[PDB]
Amino acid sequence: MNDVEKLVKLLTSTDSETQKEAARDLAEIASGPASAIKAIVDAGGVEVLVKLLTSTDSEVQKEAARALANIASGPDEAIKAIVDAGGVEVLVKLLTSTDSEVQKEAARALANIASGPDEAIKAIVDAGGVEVLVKLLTSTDSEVQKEAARALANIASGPDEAIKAIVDAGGVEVLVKLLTSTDSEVQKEAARALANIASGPTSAIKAIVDAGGVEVLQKLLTSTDSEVQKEAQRALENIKSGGWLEH
Amino acid sequence: MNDVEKLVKLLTSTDSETQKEAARDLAEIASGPASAIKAIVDAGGVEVLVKLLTSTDSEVQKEAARALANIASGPDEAIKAIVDAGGVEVLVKLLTSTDSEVQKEAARALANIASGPDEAIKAIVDAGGVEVLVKLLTSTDSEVQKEAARALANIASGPDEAIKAIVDAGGVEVLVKLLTSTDSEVQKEAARALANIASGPTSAIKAIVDAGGVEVLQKLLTSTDSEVQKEAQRALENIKSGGWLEH
């Protein structure tokens, strides 16, 4: 066995300390090159990490989720490995963990998965992750809010079905509420999510209009944060086009 | 009125000669910069061109379709203008024109539209364009075959639903048959379409396998055409991954 294969073996230790440490080392390795990530994938690390997500020890869950989130930030092949191992359905369940770090890592992993191919986003939608993520937008934990908003923004950059899922879950109204959040990062992600939702079907534009989103986006044109301004402008222009008709 | 607005006005002439000529000049203008294309769009040219598609004069239809195809090769905003004007449903109908030039231009326009955002591809799928395009893959007209295959390849680069539409229409078997076509251009497009279909759901991989596509792609690894080889290799690697599970 090579070094990565040894770490992956330690993930199966019966000692939480050993498990957490192996997952932590794998997470660090995953934060490196795409080649390092491919090493973990070829070593069967994803399947094992996905199993660790079901650990009764939140510490193990958090570290395994963190490793997968780092892996999910790699090549599409890495993301596909996670999806094919059934990792999305499990990460969606961890979104409701009472442990905030588990929630955060789970959301960050889903957000990274959502930055992948349309098939990766579909996996999240089919797993019912959108409705759960929308609920997390109102988490009392700022970090959880940020990751949830970022995940939704990425999901909204996918196919029509993904945006429709956000709309049906009532996410538009919630995201519009977050446009005036004092948490800069949250506001930026909420603005990007809406700009993306606005490039979808006309029905999504209608939801934005109903939520009074046009008036809120208009005020953000004066935001001192250029990223928020930039997203607000893109969202407004998309709204002006009216979205794509559902024929 | 500016020069483009004048041309767009001539499209409504009662003289086919004037109409054809205006559409032809607009097509030429559209083959230029993105700014030139935006000029036509802002002048309301798309709506008018889409109406000309319903002309009883095949000569007018062909020239209007040609102008729209050139327009569709521009910015996503140009493609959206076509979709929002109901141009896709009409172009789909022209695919079955007995006039080969109309078929070719209609297919080329749809192919260009399909190179756009996922919402543009969805419009084609919802209009039932996939099944019609699959039928055109066996057209006795080589050019029509090429445009149809190119359109399907682009459609296959979209969301899961788009690939599923190709599979349900029996397109996979047909595309595999075209892999051994003597028409280089057709073969290249068929290979790209399959490579794209292979990055979809596992069910699409299964269709490729059933069609005996793995063995045909394997033989193309020896093709003297590097593009075919390159697509065959990509398709084979996608097949090896097994596609994305439908959870």
Layout of helices and strands:
The structure is a homodimer of 247-residue chains.
Chain A: H1 3-10, H2 16-30, H3 34-42, H4 45-52, H5 58-71, H6 76-84, H7 87-94, H8 100-113, H9 118-126, H10 129-136, H11 142-155, H12 160-168, H13 171-178, H14 184-197, H15 202-210, H16 213-219, H17 226-241
Q: In summary, what is this structure?
A:
The first copy, chain A, has 247 residues and is mainly α.
Q: Main attributes?
A:
homodimer; 247 residues; mainly alpha; Leucine-rich Repeat Variant; 17 helices; 0% strand; de novo protein
If you had to describe this structure to a student in words, what would you say it looks like?
Two copies of one chain form a homodimer. With 247 residues, chain A is an all-alpha fold. Chain A has a single domain, classed as Leucine-rich Repeat Variant, CATH 1.25.10. Chain A contains 17 helices and no strands. Chain A has helices at residues 3-10, 16-30, 34-42, 45-52, 58-71, 76-84, 87-94, 100-113, 118-126, 129-136, 142-155, 160-168, 171-178, 184-197, 202-210, 213-219, 226-241. In chain A, helix 5 runs parallel beside helix 8 (100-113). The longest helix of chain A has 16 residues, at 226-241. The radius of gyration of chain A is 19 Å and the shape is elongated. Chain A starts with a helix and ends in a 6-residue tail after the last helix. Chains A and B meet through helix 6 and helix 9 of A and helix 6 and helix 9 of B. The PDB classes it as de novo protein. Keywords: Structural Genomics, PSI-Biology, Protein Structure Initiative, Northeast Structural Genomics Consortium, nesg, DE novo protein. It forms a dimeric assembly. The entry is titled "Crystal Structure of Engineered Protein. Northeast Structural Genomics Consortium Target OR329". Chains A, B: De Novo Protein OR329.
